[PDB]
Structure 1
Amino acid sequence: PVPPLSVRPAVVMQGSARNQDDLTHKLADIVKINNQLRRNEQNGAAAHVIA
C-alpha cells in the first residue's frame, strides 16, 4: 500500500523546489528496484542478479 499524500506531505519550501517526506523517498527507492526487477523478468536474466 502507498499511503496518501496527507500521510507523507510534500511542503512548498523557500527554495521553489518542493520538499518530499522521508516516506516518499523510501517509496521512490522501492519503485525503482521493483521496476528494475520487473525488467529482469520480462526478459530473462541470470538468477544471480534476480536474487
Structure 2
Amino acid sequence: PPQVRPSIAMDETTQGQDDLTHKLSDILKANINVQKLEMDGSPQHIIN
C-alpha cells in the first residue's frame, strides 16, 4: 500500500515519488511491454 512507500514532499505542494513507486511503475511498464510483443513481430531477440 502507499503506507509502505509514502509520497515524500520535497517542498510543501510538490510531492516526490518514493523510489519504490518509480520501481513498481517501471516494472508495470515492462510487464505491459512483454504482453505487447507476442501480438506482433517478436523475433526471439526482442523477447529475450
Same fold (TM over 0.5): yes
Which residue is 1:30 aligned to? 27
TM-score after normalising by structure 2: 0.77
Identity %: 44
Q: Structure 1 stretches of 5 or more lacking a match? A: none
Q: Structure 2 stretches of 5 or more lacking a match? A: none
Aligned residue pair count: 48
Is 1:21 the equivalent of 2:14?
no
1:14-43 per-residue CA deviation (whole Å, 9 max, x = no partner) reads: 263321111011111101111111000233
Return the structure number with greater strand share.
2
TM-score after normalising by structure 1: 0.73
